[PDB]
């Protein structure tokens, strides 16, 4: 039924190397050149990717700043209320970012804020204008 294991022998392959006298030598030079074609292209992107590695020198280590461990509180200082409305104006519905700006309000107190002070802070108008951008 099937070849020895390792011999490659499709009906298709067989005719392609028989079609003429040097149809053997032919298809084995389209492959020696497909192989050089990729080999030099592999050599290319190696140096393109080697230059882009040198720009990334230093990482972002100058540029990274410390983490602020701060215990999450409950009450809303009028300060934190005002940070909130500005974060809503700049972050839409991304309750995670707003909880990072305010710093000591959980992502749910953030969501609660949206309805409690919804009236008094025109949260709706604010969101409309967020969406304009």
């Amino acid at each position: 039924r099937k070849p020895p294991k390792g011999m490659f022998l499709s009906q298709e392959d067989v005719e392609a190397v028989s079609a003429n006298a040097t149809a053997a030598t032919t298809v084995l030079r389209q492959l020696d050149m497909e192989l050089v074609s990729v080999k030099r292209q592999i050599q290319n992107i190696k140096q393109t990717n080697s230059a882009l590695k040198e720009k990334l020198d230093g990482g972002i280590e100058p540029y990274r700043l410390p983490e602020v461990i701060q215990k999450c509180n409950a009450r809303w200082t009028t300060e934190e209320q005002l940070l909130a409305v500005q974060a809503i104006r700049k972050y839409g519905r991304d309750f995670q970012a707003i909880s990072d700006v305010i710093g000591n309000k959980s992502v749910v107190q953030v969501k609660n804020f949206f309805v409690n002070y919804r009236r008094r802070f025109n949260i709706d108008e604010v969101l409309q204008e967020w969406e304009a951008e």
Binding site: P4, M7, L9, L31, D32, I45, N49, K53, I60
Partner: protein, 664 residues
């Protein structure tokens, strides 16, 4: 048991052959029980003969030693025994005769050729009470069973291997005739052109690849039906090359898709670094912006304080992104160490490889005595189903001892070249000349002619032998289509053994594909200090154009490299054969040529029947018969196959001119 007698007679022990159906059509069409009785009587007589083949097995002896119920029916035993004795399955070869031969002899047969097939028929026909004369162009019997002998040096230029005694008629002969049969130890060390052994690593690697490529052709043959190409039949070598190409093609497609996994990941990294460089540039800018917004001294109003917190959030956001992206950059710089460390195979075969593989093809061209370019892909190995069992042997006292043993008591005319065969509705006359003074002409008249002329002789154009009338087209076309190839031996006779004596045979690897046959193999086989060097393939037909010294030169060279330039003495005696040269052979033995089949081997064996002399007289008897190694489909190009075909035709001829009274 009795079933072993049937195996050793090349006969299915539990079925009637087509031969036996012809002679016993009552039985094989009859009830299952009679068939078994017959089959036992058949196998039991075989066992009797086989158990002691130095004396005749008379019908009386046979019936004596059967018991009931099997010895009840005496005509069934007489029919079986007669059948056997007739077609040379018992009382063949060299046996003492109980019933000494009849004084008066029936019919007259001329036999062209004292080869082994010739002698085997002659010996049976005389055994049947016929008049048999053998015509011989050579000054010796044996034909292509040649044996060099000088002093104590002994070495066959012809056949030398008994291919193993499991069902081999030669097994019987060797009991009858003194033969010193020595097993051949199968180990063959290869030695490159330089003189250095091939390492066990390579020598196994190529050989498995060789064996693997053969099966590949066989699968191309039967499974993909790859048997015609450009309206011509495909040859073995032609398809071995297509199979090596498709493996060289595979190695390349395998590197292409692997290196193409590297570009498919190099450019993942290209895109990944480009995010990472444009992300460090956003980070570089916000850090500045957050610095300036933190520079504003408190206490701040709330928009200015939101600006510090905001830029802070936004920098921690783009710092996750860049950290995640040099996480991912870690996975891709490791996968690129992976792939660039697991390359697929560099080549399909190296020139040290393809040159040792070429030695395995020299062996296969030695086996078949022809360039692999000429063997039929479909059929070159049709005779493989009938292989014998057991070790292959050589004949240590020289294998001419067998023809000479057979020729005892026979009428042999040596130095007698047949030159015209003339067969008619009323008899035949064969015209021979004396080989020494070719003027002196001979005429032999006879009832039938048995032609054991080598296929190469029959192939010769312009003819060495003329048939009057000409052979029919169906016979001459079989003669053109069949293959008759060539191989030669160089015999090297030294005063002392300087090779590994525990190694019967050791190879030599050739530098070229073209010269793979040239002195590719050596045999220690004999008591004495004799090495024997083979010339196969395309090299066979070319070394015949080259003097003995030049050939013995290349052999001394080749051996110095392998055993050292000072352990190799001069040879005391040298013999080169040239079988395509030899006009009584014109080659070495037959091979299934591309465009031929084993069916041609059967055409070769059909007798010729001359037309009627008087128009409208009855359809005559057949007059011209053919035997010889090229006529036996299931055992071609062998000795045992010659033997067998001579046994066959002697039965055929006797059934014709003596009648076969055992078919009733």
């Amino acid at each position: 048991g009795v079933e072993g007698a049937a195996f050793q007679s090349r006969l299915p022990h539990d079925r009637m052959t087509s031969q036996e159906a012809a002679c016993f059509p009552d039985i094989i069409s009859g009830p299952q029980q009679t068939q078994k009785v017959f089959l036992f009587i058949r196998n039991r007589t075989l066992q009797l003969w086989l158990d002691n083949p130095k004396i005749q097995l008379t019908f009386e002896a046979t019936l004596q030693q059967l018991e009931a119920p099997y010895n009840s029916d005496t005509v069934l035993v007489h029919r079986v025994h007669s059948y056997l004795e007739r077609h040379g399955l018992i009382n063949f070869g060299i046996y003492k005769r109980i019933k000494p031969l009849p004084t008066k002899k029936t019919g007259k047969v001329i036999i062209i050729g004292s080869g082994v097939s010739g002698l085997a028929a002659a010996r049976q026909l005389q055994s049947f009470g016929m008049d048999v004369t053998l015509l011989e162009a050579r000054d010796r019997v044996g034909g292509r069973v040649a044996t060099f002998r000088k002093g104590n040096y002994v070495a066959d230029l012809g056949a030398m291997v008994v291919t193993g005694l499991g069902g081999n008629p030669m097994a019987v002969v060797s009991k009858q005739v003194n033969m010193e049969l020595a097993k051949i130890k199968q180990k063959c060390p290869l030695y490159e052109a330089n003189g250095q052994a091939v390492p066990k690593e390579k020598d196994e690697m190529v050989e498995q690849e060789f064996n693997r490529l053969l099966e590949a052709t066989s699968y191309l043959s039967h499974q993909l039906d790859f048997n015609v190409l450009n309206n011509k039949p495909v040859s073995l070598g032609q398809a071995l090359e297509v199979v090596i190409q498709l493996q060289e093609k595979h190695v390349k497609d395998e590197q292409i898709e692997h290196w193409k996994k590297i570009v498919k990941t190099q450019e993942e990294l290209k895109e990944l670094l480009n995010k990472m460089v444009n992300l460090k540039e956003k980070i570089k800018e916000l850090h500045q912006q957050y610095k300036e917004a933190s520079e504003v001294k408190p206490p701040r109003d709330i928009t200015a304080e939101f600006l510090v917190k905001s830029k802070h959030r936004d920098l921690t956001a783009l710092c996750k992104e860049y950290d995640e992206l040099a996480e991912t950059q870690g996975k891709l710089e490791e996968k690129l160490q992976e792939l660039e460390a697991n390359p697929p195979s560099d080549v399909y075969l190296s020139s040290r490889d393809r040159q040792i593989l070429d030695w395995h093809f020299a062996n296969l061209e030695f086996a078949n005595a022809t360039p692999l370019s000429t063997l039929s892909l479909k059929h070159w190995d049709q005779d493989d189903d009938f292989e014998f069992t057991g070790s292959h042997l050589t004949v240590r006292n020289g294998y001419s001892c067998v023809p000479v043993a057979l020729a005892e008591g026979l009428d042999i005319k040596l130095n007698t070249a047949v030159r015209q065969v003339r067969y008619t509705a009323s008899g035949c006359e064969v015209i021979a000349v004396n080989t020494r003074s070719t003027s002196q002409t001979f005429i032999y008249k006879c009832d039938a002619v048995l032609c054991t002329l080598p296929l190469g002789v029959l192939k010769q154009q312009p003819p060495a032998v003329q048939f009057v009338p000409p052979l029919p087209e169906w016979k001459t076309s079989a003669v053109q289509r069949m293959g008759f190839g060539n191989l030669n031996k160089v015999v090297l006779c030294f005063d002392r053994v300087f090779w590994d004596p525990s190694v019967n045979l050791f190879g030599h690897v050739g530098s070229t594909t073209a010269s793979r046959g040239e002195l590719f193999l050596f045999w220690n086989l004999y008591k004495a200090p004799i090495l024997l060097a083979l010339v196969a393939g395309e090299a066979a037909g070319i070394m015949e154009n080259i003097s003995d010294d030049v050939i013995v030169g290349r052999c001394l060279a080749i051996l110095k490299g392998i055993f050292g330039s000072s352990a190799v003495p001069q040879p005391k005696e040298t013999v080169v054969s040239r079988w395509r040269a030899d006009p009584w052979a014109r080659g070495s033995y037959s091979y299934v040529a591309a465009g031929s089949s084993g069916n041609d081997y059967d055409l070769m064996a059909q007798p010729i029947t001359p037309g009627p002399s008087i128009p409208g007289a009855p359809q005559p008897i057949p007059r011209l018969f053919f035997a010889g190694e090229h006529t036996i489909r299931n055992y071609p190009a062998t000795v045992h196959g010659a033997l067998l075909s001579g046994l066959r035709e002697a039965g055929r001829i006797a059934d014709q001119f003596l009648g076969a009274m055992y078919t009733l």
